[PDB]
Amino acid sequence: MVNWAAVVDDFYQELFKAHPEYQNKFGFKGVALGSLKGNAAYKTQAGKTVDYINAAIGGSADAAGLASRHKGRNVGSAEFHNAKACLAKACSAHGAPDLGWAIDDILSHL
Numbered sequence: 001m002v003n004w005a006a007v008v009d010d011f012y013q014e015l016f017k018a019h020p021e022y023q024n025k026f027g028f029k030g031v032a033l034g035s036l037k038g039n040a041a042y043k044t045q046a047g048k049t050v051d052y053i054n055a056a057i058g059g060s061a062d063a064a065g066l067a068s069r070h071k072g073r074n075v076g077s078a079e080f081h082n083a084k085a086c087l088a089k090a091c092s093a094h095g096a097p098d099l100g101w102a103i104d105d106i107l108s109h110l
């Protein structure tokens with residue numbers, strides 16, 4: 001099956017490399033990017049992100065709910081447009097399908 005866990009790991013490497021300040025909103029704030037795989041808070045976030053992707057593909061994802069929760073962290077359209085770019089790169093590096101349509105569904109509520 002598609003290695004979404006590896007995709008998500010690459011996504012966060014791309015995201016925090018381009019926008020390091022985004023990392024400050026997480027429980028792994030301050031942790032070196034190359035060491036995130038060994039951080040408990042990151043493991044949990046990465047897993048939830050993978051789950052969300054599998055939910056989006058499976059048809060159960062609550063994009064409105066995810067959008068609302070991100071707004072509740074002061075994360076909105078600008079951030080998700082930036083994330084769309086990083087996720088496209090991560091997917092391409094794994095021969096995985098692009099997830100732009102999934103991000104667009106979240107953007108439709110932001």
Ligand code: HEM
Pocket residue numbers: 022023025026027045048049052053069070073075079080083084087103
């Ligand atoms: C591909 C785009 C993204 C996806 C699929 C995604 C997915 C998720 C998911 C599934 C959660 C957990 C929600 C829950 O527990 O109900 C979450 C939480 C969160 N996301 Fe995102 N996210 C994305 C982009 C971003 C970006 C760009 C930021 C920028 C700061 C961000 C910041 C956060 C924060 C701060 C949390 C809460 C972390 C915590 O509870 O400690 N997300 N995200």
